[PDB]
Amino acid sequence: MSHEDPGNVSYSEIGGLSEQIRELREVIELPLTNPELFQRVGIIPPKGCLLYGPPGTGKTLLARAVASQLDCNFLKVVSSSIVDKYIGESARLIREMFNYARDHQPCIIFMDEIDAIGGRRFSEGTSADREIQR
Amino acid sequence: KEQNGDVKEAASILQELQVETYGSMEKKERVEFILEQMRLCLAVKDYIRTQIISKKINTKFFQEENTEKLKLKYYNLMIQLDQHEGSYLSICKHYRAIYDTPCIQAESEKWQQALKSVVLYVILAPFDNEQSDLVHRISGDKKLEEIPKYKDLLKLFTTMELMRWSTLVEDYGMELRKGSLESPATDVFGSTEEGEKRWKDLKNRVVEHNIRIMAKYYTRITMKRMAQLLDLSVDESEAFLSNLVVNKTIFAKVDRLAGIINFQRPKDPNNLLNDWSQKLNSLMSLVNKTTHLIAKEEMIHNLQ
Protein backbone atom coordinates (compact mmCIF):
# COMPACT_ATOMS: atom_id res chain seq x y z
CA MET A 1 0.00 0.00 0.00
CA SER A 2 3.03 2.28 -0.38
CA HIS A 3 4.64 1.69 -3.79
CA GLU A 4 1.44 0.36 -5.33
CA ASP A 5 -0.77 3.11 -6.76
CA PRO A 6 -0.04 4.12 -10.37
CA GLY A 7 -0.06 7.72 -11.49
CA ASN A 8 -3.09 9.86 -12.20
CA VAL A 9 -4.14 13.16 -13.74
CA SER A 10 -4.18 16.11 -11.36
CA TYR A 11 -7.46 17.44 -9.95
CA SER A 12 -7.86 19.49 -13.14
CA GLU A 13 -9.50 16.36 -14.55
CA ILE A 14 -12.28 16.33 -11.96
CA GLY A 15 -14.54 19.32 -11.48
CA GLY A 16 -17.75 20.69 -10.08
CA LEU A 17 -16.63 20.71 -6.43
CA SER A 18 -13.70 23.14 -6.55
CA GLU A 19 -14.88 24.58 -3.23
CA GLN A 20 -14.04 21.25 -1.62
CA ILE A 21 -10.98 20.94 -3.88
CA ARG A 22 -9.46 24.06 -2.36
CA GLU A 23 -10.93 23.15 1.03
CA LEU A 24 -8.86 20.00 1.43
CA ARG A 25 -5.77 21.97 0.41
CA GLU A 26 -5.81 23.97 3.65
CA VAL A 27 -5.94 20.84 5.81
CA ILE A 28 -3.32 18.89 3.86
CA GLU A 29 -1.10 20.77 1.44
CA LEU A 30 -0.94 24.21 3.04
CA PRO A 31 -0.11 23.36 6.70
CA LEU A 32 3.09 21.59 5.64
CA THR A 33 4.11 23.94 2.83
CA ASN A 34 3.64 27.11 4.91
CA PRO A 35 3.23 26.27 8.61
CA GLU A 36 4.26 29.82 9.49
CA LEU A 37 0.80 31.39 9.33
CA PHE A 38 -0.68 28.84 11.74
CA GLN A 39 2.03 29.94 14.17
CA ARG A 40 1.53 33.65 13.50
CA VAL A 41 -2.16 33.49 14.36
CA GLY A 42 -1.17 30.85 16.90
CA ILE A 43 -3.65 28.06 16.09
CA ILE A 44 -2.91 24.39 15.51
CA PRO A 45 -3.95 23.08 12.08
CA PRO A 46 -6.66 20.43 11.72
CA LYS A 47 -5.89 16.72 12.02
CA GLY A 48 -8.34 14.47 10.19
CA CYS A 49 -10.95 14.83 7.48
CA LEU A 50 -13.92 12.71 6.43
CA LEU A 51 -15.58 12.26 3.05
CA TYR A 52 -19.19 11.17 2.65
CA GLY A 53 -21.96 11.29 0.11
CA PRO A 54 -23.72 9.08 -2.41
CA PRO A 55 -21.66 6.51 -4.30
CA GLY A 56 -19.99 7.68 -7.47
CA THR A 57 -19.71 11.30 -6.41
CA GLY A 58 -16.00 10.87 -7.14
CA LYS A 59 -14.96 10.25 -3.55
CA THR A 60 -12.27 7.72 -4.46
CA LEU A 61 -11.40 9.80 -7.51
CA LEU A 62 -10.54 12.93 -5.53
CA ALA A 63 -8.22 10.97 -3.26
CA ARG A 64 -6.66 9.50 -6.41
CA ALA A 65 -5.88 12.98 -7.70
CA VAL A 66 -4.52 14.10 -4.32
CA ALA A 67 -2.23 11.09 -3.95
CA SER A 68 -1.21 11.66 -7.58
CA GLN A 69 0.77 14.68 -6.36
CA LEU A 70 3.08 13.04 -3.81
CA ASP A 71 2.94 9.44 -5.10
CA CYS A 72 5.65 8.42 -2.60
CA ASN A 73 4.49 9.52 0.86
CA PHE A 74 0.94 8.19 0.70
CA LEU A 75 -0.56 5.13 2.37
CA LYS A 76 -3.89 3.70 1.21
CA VAL A 77 -6.14 1.23 3.02
CA VAL A 78 -9.30 -0.64 2.04
CA SER A 79 -10.27 -0.89 5.74
CA SER A 80 -11.32 -4.49 5.03
CA SER A 81 -8.13 -6.52 4.42
CA ILE A 82 -7.05 -5.86 8.01
CA VAL A 83 -8.93 -8.82 9.49
CA ASP A 84 -7.20 -12.17 9.94
CA LYS A 85 -7.67 -15.61 11.50
CA TYR A 86 -5.80 -15.01 14.76
CA ILE A 87 -6.66 -13.20 17.98
CA GLY A 88 -4.30 -10.25 17.74
CA GLU A 89 -2.30 -9.79 14.54
CA SER A 90 -4.66 -7.04 13.32
CA ALA A 91 -4.20 -4.19 15.79
CA ARG A 92 -0.43 -4.74 15.54
CA LEU A 93 -0.73 -3.97 11.83
CA ILE A 94 -2.26 -0.62 12.79
CA ARG A 95 0.58 -0.12 15.27
CA GLU A 96 3.34 -0.59 12.73
CA MET A 97 1.34 1.51 10.28
CA PHE A 98 1.38 4.47 12.66
CA ASN A 99 5.01 3.67 13.48
CA TYR A 100 6.17 3.76 9.87
CA ALA A 101 4.04 6.87 9.47
CA ARG A 102 5.90 8.03 12.55
CA ASP A 103 9.13 7.21 10.72
CA HIS A 104 8.46 9.38 7.70
CA GLN A 105 7.49 12.77 8.96
CA PRO A 106 4.93 14.11 6.41
CA CYS A 107 2.73 11.03 6.17
CA ILE A 108 -0.71 10.86 4.57
CA ILE A 109 -2.99 7.99 5.58
CA PHE A 110 -6.10 7.12 3.59
CA MET A 111 -8.81 4.70 4.68
CA ASP A 112 -11.81 3.94 2.51
CA GLU A 113 -15.10 2.50 3.78
CA ILE A 114 -14.60 2.66 7.53
CA ASP A 115 -18.05 1.09 7.94
CA ALA A 116 -16.45 -2.35 7.63
CA ILE A 117 -14.15 -1.72 10.58
CA GLY A 118 -16.06 1.30 11.86
CA GLY A 119 -19.21 0.03 13.54
CA ARG A 120 -20.79 1.88 16.43
CA ARG A 121 -21.13 -0.43 19.47
CA PHE A 122 -22.70 -3.71 20.61
CA SER A 123 -24.12 -4.92 23.92
CA GLU A 124 -21.85 -7.96 24.22
CA GLY A 125 -22.57 -9.61 20.90
CA THR A 126 -20.15 -12.10 19.36
CA SER A 127 -16.43 -12.49 20.15
CA ALA A 128 -15.39 -11.63 16.59
CA ASP A 129 -17.20 -8.38 17.29
CA ARG A 130 -14.75 -7.99 20.17
CA GLU A 131 -11.75 -8.58 17.91
CA ILE A 132 -13.15 -5.93 15.58
CA GLN A 133 -13.93 -3.42 18.33
CA ARG A 134 -10.48 -3.87 19.84
CA LYS B 1 7.38 62.62 14.00
CA GLU B 2 4.70 65.12 12.92
CA GLN B 3 3.78 66.19 16.46
CA ASN B 4 7.35 65.15 17.41
CA GLY B 5 5.77 62.73 19.86
CA ASP B 6 5.27 62.89 23.63
CA VAL B 7 4.63 60.36 26.38
CA LYS B 8 1.41 59.42 24.59
CA GLU B 9 2.55 59.85 20.98
CA ALA B 10 5.59 57.74 21.85
CA ALA B 11 3.19 55.30 23.53
CA SER B 12 1.42 54.96 20.17
CA ILE B 13 4.26 52.93 18.66
CA LEU B 14 4.36 50.77 21.81
CA GLN B 15 1.45 48.59 20.66
CA GLU B 16 2.70 47.80 17.14
CA LEU B 17 6.27 46.78 17.99
CA GLN B 18 6.21 42.97 18.03
CA VAL B 19 3.89 42.96 15.00
CA GLU B 20 6.40 42.62 12.17
CA THR B 21 8.61 40.42 14.28
CA TYR B 22 5.92 37.95 13.22
CA GLY B 23 5.06 39.66 9.94
CA SER B 24 8.65 39.59 8.72
CA MET B 25 11.94 40.85 10.18
CA GLU B 26 14.54 42.42 7.89
CA LYS B 27 18.17 42.85 8.92
CA LYS B 28 18.33 46.50 7.83
CA GLU B 29 14.77 47.73 8.30
CA ARG B 30 13.22 45.73 11.11
CA VAL B 31 16.30 46.41 13.24
CA GLU B 32 16.13 50.18 12.79
CA PHE B 33 12.40 50.17 13.47
CA ILE B 34 12.73 47.82 16.44
CA LEU B 35 15.39 49.90 18.19
CA GLU B 36 13.53 53.12 17.41
CA GLN B 37 10.76 52.88 20.00
CA MET B 38 12.80 51.98 23.09
CA ARG B 39 14.46 55.40 23.08
CA LEU B 40 10.95 56.86 23.23
CA CYS B 41 10.40 54.50 26.15
CA LEU B 42 13.46 56.19 27.65
CA ALA B 43 11.78 59.56 27.12
CA VAL B 44 8.75 58.10 28.92
CA LYS B 45 10.97 57.23 31.91
CA ASP B 46 10.13 53.54 31.54
CA TYR B 47 12.77 50.82 31.75
CA ILE B 48 10.94 47.58 32.58
CA ARG B 49 9.47 47.64 29.08
CA THR B 50 12.60 49.09 27.49
CA GLN B 51 14.72 46.13 28.56
CA ILE B 52 12.08 43.59 27.53
CA ILE B 53 11.69 45.07 24.06
CA SER B 54 15.48 45.43 24.01
CA LYS B 55 15.85 41.68 24.58
CA LYS B 56 14.84 41.27 20.96
CA ILE B 57 17.79 43.51 20.07
CA ASN B 58 20.64 41.38 21.45
CA THR B 59 19.29 38.39 19.52
CA LYS B 60 19.35 40.42 16.28
CA PHE B 61 23.13 40.76 16.00
CA PHE B 62 25.45 39.25 13.33
CA GLN B 63 24.56 41.97 10.85
CA GLU B 64 26.89 44.59 12.36
CA GLU B 65 29.37 43.25 9.77
CA ASN B 66 27.43 45.15 7.08
CA THR B 67 25.73 47.68 9.37
CA GLU B 68 28.25 50.28 10.53
CA LYS B 69 26.46 53.48 11.59
CA LEU B 70 23.52 51.82 13.34
CA LYS B 71 24.10 48.29 14.66
CA LEU B 72 27.05 48.84 16.98
CA LYS B 73 26.00 52.48 17.42
CA TYR B 74 22.69 52.17 19.23
CA TYR B 75 24.56 50.60 22.17
CA ASN B 76 25.49 54.16 23.17
CA LEU B 77 21.74 54.49 23.69
CA MET B 78 21.69 51.08 25.37
CA ILE B 79 23.84 52.28 28.28
CA GLN B 80 20.94 54.60 29.04
CA LEU B 81 19.08 51.43 30.00
CA ASP B 82 22.24 49.91 31.50
CA GLN B 83 22.91 53.19 33.32
CA HIS B 84 19.80 53.60 35.48
CA GLU B 85 20.72 51.13 38.22
CA GLY B 86 24.18 50.26 39.49
CA SER B 87 24.91 47.75 36.73
CA TYR B 88 28.54 48.82 36.51
CA LEU B 89 29.69 45.37 35.40
CA SER B 90 27.02 45.15 32.69
CA ILE B 91 28.50 48.17 30.89
CA CYS B 92 31.97 46.63 31.26
CA LYS B 93 31.49 44.36 28.27
CA HIS B 94 29.36 47.09 26.69
CA TYR B 95 32.07 49.71 26.26
CA ARG B 96 34.27 46.99 24.78
CA ALA B 97 31.44 46.33 22.34
CA ILE B 98 31.31 50.02 21.38
CA TYR B 99 35.12 50.09 21.62
CA ASP B 100 35.43 48.78 18.06
CA THR B 101 33.27 51.29 16.14
CA PRO B 102 35.82 54.10 16.66
CA CYS B 103 38.37 51.45 15.60
CA ILE B 104 36.56 50.11 12.55
CA GLN B 105 36.16 53.83 12.00
CA ALA B 106 39.83 53.97 12.88
CA GLU B 107 40.05 57.47 14.32
CA SER B 108 41.77 57.02 17.69
CA GLU B 109 40.26 60.10 19.30
CA LYS B 110 36.72 58.94 20.00
CA TRP B 111 38.37 55.53 20.03
CA GLN B 112 40.92 57.15 22.34
CA GLN B 113 38.20 58.14 24.81
CA ALA B 114 36.79 54.65 24.32
CA LEU B 115 40.01 53.31 25.85
CA LYS B 116 39.61 55.36 29.05
CA SER B 117 35.84 54.87 28.99
CA VAL B 118 35.93 51.07 29.07
CA VAL B 119 38.41 51.05 31.97
CA LEU B 120 37.44 53.92 34.30
CA TYR B 121 34.77 51.78 36.03
CA VAL B 122 36.07 48.20 35.96
CA ILE B 123 37.43 49.13 39.37
CA LEU B 124 33.93 50.51 39.97
CA ALA B 125 32.44 47.04 39.52
CA PRO B 126 32.13 44.69 42.52
CA PHE B 127 34.75 41.98 42.53
CA ASP B 128 34.09 38.83 40.54
CA ASN B 129 36.18 36.26 38.73
CA GLU B 130 34.65 37.88 35.64
CA GLN B 131 36.35 41.05 36.85
CA SER B 132 39.64 39.37 37.77
CA ASP B 133 39.96 37.84 34.29
CA LEU B 134 38.47 40.69 32.25
CA VAL B 135 41.07 42.93 33.88
CA HIS B 136 43.57 40.43 32.48
CA ARG B 137 42.11 40.65 28.97
CA ILE B 138 42.03 44.44 29.10
CA SER B 139 45.55 43.98 30.46
CA GLY B 140 48.27 43.27 27.93
CA ASP B 141 46.53 45.48 25.37
CA LYS B 142 48.61 46.65 22.41
CA LYS B 143 47.06 50.10 22.89
CA LEU B 144 46.78 50.00 26.69
CA GLU B 145 50.04 51.92 27.09
CA GLU B 146 48.27 54.86 25.41
CA ILE B 147 46.87 55.61 28.89
CA PRO B 148 49.94 56.15 31.11
CA LYS B 149 47.61 56.38 34.12
CA TYR B 150 46.60 52.75 33.51
CA LYS B 151 49.57 51.66 35.63
CA ASP B 152 48.59 54.00 38.47
CA LEU B 153 45.21 52.31 38.07
CA LEU B 154 47.17 49.03 38.04
CA LYS B 155 48.31 49.65 41.61
CA LEU B 156 44.76 48.74 42.68
CA PHE B 157 45.13 45.30 41.08
CA THR B 158 47.23 43.03 43.32
CA THR B 159 48.00 42.96 47.06
CA MET B 160 46.58 46.55 47.34
CA GLU B 161 48.20 47.40 50.73
CA LEU B 162 49.08 51.14 50.91
CA MET B 163 46.63 52.29 48.23
CA ARG B 164 45.46 54.94 50.68
CA TRP B 165 42.44 56.78 49.32
CA SER B 166 44.05 60.09 50.28
CA THR B 167 47.08 59.38 48.08
CA LEU B 168 44.59 58.07 45.52
CA VAL B 169 42.76 61.40 45.27
CA GLU B 170 46.14 63.12 45.40
CA ASP B 171 47.13 61.18 42.27
CA TYR B 172 43.71 61.28 40.59
CA GLY B 173 42.20 64.72 41.25
CA MET B 174 43.08 65.85 37.71
CA GLU B 175 41.89 62.78 35.80
CA LEU B 176 38.38 63.73 36.93
CA ARG B 177 38.43 67.34 35.71
CA LYS B 178 41.62 67.65 33.65
CA GLY B 179 42.84 65.36 30.88
CA SER B 180 42.73 65.13 27.11
CA LEU B 181 39.51 63.14 26.65
CA GLU B 182 38.18 63.36 30.22
CA SER B 183 34.61 62.45 29.23
CA PRO B 184 34.24 59.00 30.86
CA ALA B 185 35.83 60.48 33.98
CA THR B 186 33.18 63.19 33.68
CA ASP B 187 30.46 60.55 33.65
CA VAL B 188 32.22 59.08 36.68
CA PHE B 189 32.58 62.28 38.71
CA GLY B 190 31.62 65.28 36.56
CA SER B 191 27.84 65.04 36.85
CA THR B 192 26.88 65.85 40.43
CA GLU B 193 24.28 63.12 40.97
CA GLU B 194 26.23 60.49 39.03
CA GLY B 195 29.69 61.71 40.01
CA GLU B 196 28.82 61.79 43.73
CA LYS B 197 27.47 58.24 43.55
CA ARG B 198 30.79 57.25 42.03
CA TRP B 199 32.75 59.10 44.72
CA LYS B 200 31.04 56.89 47.28
CA ASP B 201 31.42 53.89 44.96
CA LEU B 202 35.14 54.63 44.71
CA LYS B 203 35.28 54.65 48.51
CA ASN B 204 33.42 51.37 48.44
CA ARG B 205 36.03 50.14 45.98
CA VAL B 206 38.86 51.36 48.23
CA VAL B 207 37.85 49.91 51.62
CA GLU B 208 36.48 46.70 50.10
CA HIS B 209 39.69 46.42 48.10
CA ASN B 210 41.85 46.51 51.23
CA ILE B 211 39.64 44.27 53.35
CA ARG B 212 40.28 41.32 51.03
CA ILE B 213 44.06 41.44 51.41
CA MET B 214 43.52 41.98 55.13
CA ALA B 215 41.79 38.60 55.21
CA LYS B 216 44.68 37.38 53.03
CA TYR B 217 47.45 38.35 55.43
CA TYR B 218 46.05 38.79 58.94
CA THR B 219 45.50 36.09 61.54
CA ARG B 220 44.06 38.63 63.97
CA ILE B 221 43.75 42.39 63.71
CA THR B 222 43.16 45.00 66.38
CA MET B 223 40.18 47.31 66.06
CA LYS B 224 42.33 50.44 66.41
CA ARG B 225 44.91 49.36 63.83
CA MET B 226 42.03 48.59 61.48
CA ALA B 227 40.46 52.02 62.01
CA GLN B 228 43.87 53.60 61.39
CA LEU B 229 44.80 51.44 58.39
CA LEU B 230 41.45 52.45 56.91
CA ASP B 231 41.58 56.07 58.17
CA LEU B 232 38.04 56.14 59.51
CA SER B 233 36.04 55.71 62.68
CA VAL B 234 35.91 52.28 64.29
CA ASP B 235 32.13 52.59 63.99
CA GLU B 236 32.53 53.05 60.24
CA SER B 237 34.78 49.98 60.19
CA GLU B 238 31.91 48.20 61.95
CA ALA B 239 29.66 49.23 59.07
CA PHE B 240 32.14 48.11 56.39
CA LEU B 241 32.64 44.71 57.99
CA SER B 242 28.96 44.25 58.83
CA ASN B 243 27.61 44.94 55.35
CA LEU B 244 30.40 42.76 53.90
CA VAL B 245 29.76 39.81 56.23
CA VAL B 246 26.03 39.98 55.51
CA ASN B 247 27.36 39.97 51.96
CA LYS B 248 29.38 36.97 53.25
CA THR B 249 31.97 37.65 50.56
CA ILE B 250 34.49 37.97 53.40
CA PHE B 251 33.93 36.13 56.67
CA ALA B 252 34.96 37.72 59.95
CA LYS B 253 34.03 37.92 63.62
CA VAL B 254 34.18 41.33 65.32
CA ASP B 255 34.90 40.34 68.90
CA ARG B 256 34.21 43.84 70.13
CA LEU B 257 34.34 43.87 73.92
CA ALA B 258 38.07 43.35 73.41
CA GLY B 259 38.17 44.67 69.84
CA ILE B 260 40.60 41.98 68.64
CA ILE B 261 39.06 40.23 65.64
CA ASN B 262 40.11 37.31 63.47
CA PHE B 263 39.99 36.55 59.76
CA GLN B 264 40.36 32.79 60.14
CA ARG B 265 38.13 29.73 60.27
CA PRO B 266 37.78 27.03 62.96
CA LYS B 267 39.53 23.70 62.49
CA ASP B 268 37.90 20.31 62.74
CA PRO B 269 40.70 17.93 63.79
CA ASN B 270 39.38 15.78 60.95
CA ASN B 271 40.39 18.71 58.74
CA LEU B 272 43.68 19.47 60.50
CA LEU B 273 44.91 15.87 60.48
CA ASN B 274 43.57 15.65 56.92
CA ASP B 275 45.85 18.47 55.80
CA TRP B 276 48.79 17.07 57.77
CA SER B 277 48.29 13.79 55.93
CA GLN B 278 48.02 15.92 52.79
CA LYS B 279 51.46 17.51 53.07
CA LEU B 280 52.93 14.24 54.30
CA ASN B 281 51.62 12.31 51.31
CA SER B 282 51.89 14.72 48.39
CA LEU B 283 54.94 16.89 49.03
CA MET B 284 57.05 14.36 50.90
CA SER B 285 56.95 11.16 48.87
CA LEU B 286 56.44 12.50 45.36
CA VAL B 287 59.13 15.18 45.21
CA ASN B 288 61.31 12.65 47.02
CA LYS B 289 60.63 10.37 44.07
CA THR B 290 61.57 13.06 41.56
CA THR B 291 64.84 14.11 43.22
CA HIS B 292 66.27 10.60 42.94
CA LEU B 293 65.55 10.55 39.20
CA ILE B 294 67.22 13.89 38.51
CA ALA B 295 70.13 12.60 40.60
CA LYS B 296 70.24 9.49 38.40
CA GLU B 297 70.31 11.69 35.30
CA GLU B 298 73.28 13.56 36.78
CA MET B 299 75.38 10.39 36.63
CA ILE B 300 74.49 9.90 32.97
CA HIS B 301 75.46 13.49 32.21
CA ASN B 302 78.68 13.47 34.24
CA LEU B 303 81.14 10.67 34.93
CA GLN B 304 79.48 7.30 34.29
Binding site: - | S242, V245, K253
Partner: protein
Protein backbone atom coordinates in the same frame (compact mmCIF):
# COMPACT_ATOMS: atom_id res chain seq x y z
CA UNK C 1 -13.50 37.09 49.43
CA UNK C 2 -15.01 36.20 52.79
CA UNK C 3 -13.88 32.66 52.08
CA UNK C 4 -10.31 33.90 52.33
CA UNK C 5 -11.40 36.16 55.20
CA UNK C 6 -12.53 33.50 57.66
CA UNK C 7 -10.19 30.85 56.23
CA UNK C 8 -7.45 33.31 57.19
CA UNK C 9 -9.32 34.18 60.41
CA UNK C 10 -7.54 31.48 62.42
CA UNK C 11 -4.17 31.77 60.65
CA UNK C 12 -3.66 28.12 59.71
CA UNK C 13 -3.54 28.11 55.90
CA UNK C 14 -2.00 31.25 54.40
CA UNK C 15 -1.94 29.79 50.88
CA UNK C 16 -5.40 28.49 50.01
CA UNK C 17 -7.00 31.53 51.64
CA UNK C 18 -4.71 33.55 49.38
CA UNK C 19 -6.30 31.52 46.59
CA UNK C 20 -9.72 32.63 47.84
CA UNK C 21 -8.68 36.27 47.68
CA UNK C 22 -7.16 35.79 44.22
CA UNK C 23 -10.32 34.03 43.03
CA UNK C 24 -12.65 36.70 44.43
CA UNK C 25 -10.56 39.46 42.86
CA UNK C 26 -10.60 37.64 39.52
CA UNK C 27 -14.38 37.56 39.86
CA UNK C 28 -14.45 41.29 40.61
CA UNK C 29 -12.16 41.82 37.60
CA UNK C 30 -13.46 44.63 35.37
CA UNK C 31 -16.97 44.44 36.85
CA UNK C 32 -16.68 46.01 40.32
CA UNK C 33 -13.95 48.53 41.17
CA UNK C 34 -14.89 49.12 44.85
CA UNK C 35 -14.95 45.38 45.59
CA UNK C 36 -11.92 44.45 43.47
CA UNK C 37 -9.82 47.28 44.92
CA UNK C 38 -9.90 45.74 48.42
CA UNK C 39 -8.75 42.26 47.39
CA UNK C 40 -5.16 43.37 46.77
CA UNK C 41 -4.69 44.49 50.39
CA UNK C 42 -5.60 41.02 51.62
CA UNK C 43 -3.70 39.05 48.98
CA UNK C 44 -0.47 40.97 49.55
CA UNK C 45 -1.13 41.02 53.30
CA UNK C 46 -1.32 37.23 53.22
CA UNK C 47 1.80 37.02 51.05
CA UNK C 48 3.95 39.33 53.19
CA UNK C 49 2.53 37.55 56.22
CA UNK C 50 3.53 34.42 54.28
CA UNK C 51 7.12 35.77 54.26
CA UNK C 52 7.42 35.84 50.44
CA UNK C 53 7.84 39.58 49.92
CA UNK C 54 9.33 40.01 46.46
CA UNK C 55 6.31 38.51 44.71
CA UNK C 56 4.28 41.40 46.15
CA UNK C 57 6.30 43.90 44.11
CA UNK C 58 6.09 41.34 41.30
CA UNK C 59 2.28 41.22 41.46
CA UNK C 60 1.94 45.01 41.64
CA UNK C 61 4.44 45.08 38.76
CA UNK C 62 2.04 42.89 36.80
CA UNK C 63 -0.03 44.66 34.17
CA UNK C 64 -3.28 43.71 35.91
CA UNK C 65 -2.23 45.66 39.01
CA UNK C 66 -1.54 48.75 36.88
CA UNK C 67 -5.29 48.86 36.24
CA UNK C 68 -5.85 49.12 40.00
CA UNK C 69 -2.82 51.04 41.24
CA UNK C 70 -3.32 53.48 44.09
CA UNK C 71 -2.36 54.70 47.54
CA UNK C 72 -3.13 51.30 49.05
CA UNK C 73 -0.93 49.24 46.72
CA UNK C 74 1.72 51.91 47.23
CA UNK C 75 1.26 51.44 50.98
CA UNK C 76 1.88 47.72 50.42
CA UNK C 77 4.96 48.51 48.33
CA UNK C 78 6.77 50.30 51.15
CA UNK C 79 5.61 47.71 53.69
CA UNK C 80 6.91 44.81 51.59
CA UNK C 81 10.14 46.76 51.09
CA UNK C 82 10.62 47.40 54.81
CA UNK C 83 9.86 43.76 55.58
CA UNK C 84 12.36 42.76 52.89
CA UNK C 85 15.04 45.03 54.35
CA UNK C 86 14.30 43.89 57.93
CA UNK C 87 13.90 47.39 59.35
CA UNK C 88 12.27 47.99 62.72
CA UNK C 89 12.27 51.70 61.80
CA UNK C 90 11.22 51.53 58.15
CA UNK C 91 8.20 49.41 59.11
CA UNK C 92 7.31 51.80 61.91
CA UNK C 93 7.74 54.72 59.51
CA UNK C 94 5.39 53.32 56.88
CA UNK C 95 2.96 52.25 59.61
CA UNK C 96 2.86 55.80 60.98
CA UNK C 97 2.73 57.46 57.57
CA UNK C 98 -0.03 55.34 55.99
CA UNK C 99 -1.85 54.66 59.25
CA UNK C 100 -5.25 55.82 57.98
CA UNK C 101 -4.69 53.73 54.86
CA UNK C 102 -3.42 51.00 57.23
CA UNK C 103 -6.41 51.00 59.60
CA UNK C 104 -8.63 49.30 57.00
CA UNK C 105 -7.83 45.76 58.17
CA UNK C 106 -10.77 44.27 60.11
CA UNK C 107 -8.17 42.90 62.54
CA UNK C 108 -5.17 45.23 62.65
CA UNK C 109 -4.23 44.06 66.15
CA UNK C 110 -3.12 40.49 65.48
CA UNK C 111 -2.12 41.15 61.87
CA UNK C 112 0.23 43.96 62.88
CA UNK C 113 1.45 42.55 66.19
CA UNK C 114 2.37 39.15 64.73
CA UNK C 115 4.17 40.60 61.71
CA UNK C 116 5.91 43.03 64.07
CA UNK C 117 7.11 40.30 66.45
CA UNK C 118 8.38 38.59 63.31
CA UNK C 119 10.19 41.84 62.48
CA UNK C 120 12.00 41.71 65.84
CA UNK C 121 14.16 38.68 65.08
CA UNK C 122 14.05 39.67 61.42
CA UNK C 123 16.07 42.64 62.64
CA UNK C 124 18.11 40.51 65.04
CA UNK C 125 19.30 38.04 62.40
CA UNK C 126 21.15 40.84 60.61
CA UNK C 127 21.98 43.10 63.57
CA UNK C 128 23.44 40.15 65.48
CA UNK C 129 25.16 38.24 62.62
CA UNK C 130 28.48 40.13 62.19
CA UNK C 131 29.77 39.63 65.74
CA UNK C 132 30.19 36.93 68.39
CA UNK C 133 31.17 38.45 71.76
CA UNK C 134 29.17 41.64 72.24
CA UNK C 135 28.23 43.98 75.05
CA UNK C 136 24.47 44.37 75.05
CA UNK C 137 24.10 48.14 75.40
CA UNK C 138 25.45 48.67 71.88
CA UNK C 139 23.04 46.19 70.34
CA UNK C 140 20.30 47.91 72.32
CA UNK C 141 21.52 51.05 70.54
CA UNK C 142 21.47 49.53 67.04
CA UNK C 143 18.02 48.07 67.72
CA UNK C 144 17.08 51.46 69.22
CA UNK C 145 15.21 49.99 72.16
CA UNK C 146 15.55 49.07 75.82
CA UNK C 147 17.81 46.14 76.66
CA UNK C 148 15.61 44.25 79.15
CA UNK C 149 13.07 43.14 76.54
CA UNK C 150 16.07 42.47 74.29
CA UNK C 151 17.40 40.12 76.97
CA UNK C 152 14.05 38.34 77.24
CA UNK C 153 13.68 38.27 73.45
CA UNK C 154 17.11 36.85 72.59
CA UNK C 155 16.82 34.54 75.60
CA UNK C 156 13.63 33.38 73.90
CA UNK C 157 15.77 32.90 70.79
CA UNK C 158 18.36 30.58 72.32
CA UNK C 159 15.60 28.92 74.35
Amino acid sequence: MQSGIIHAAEEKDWKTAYSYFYEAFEGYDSIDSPKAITSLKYMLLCKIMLNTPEDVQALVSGKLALRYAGRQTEALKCVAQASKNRSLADFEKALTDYRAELRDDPIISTHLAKLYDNLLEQNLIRVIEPFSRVQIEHISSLIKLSKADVERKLSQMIL
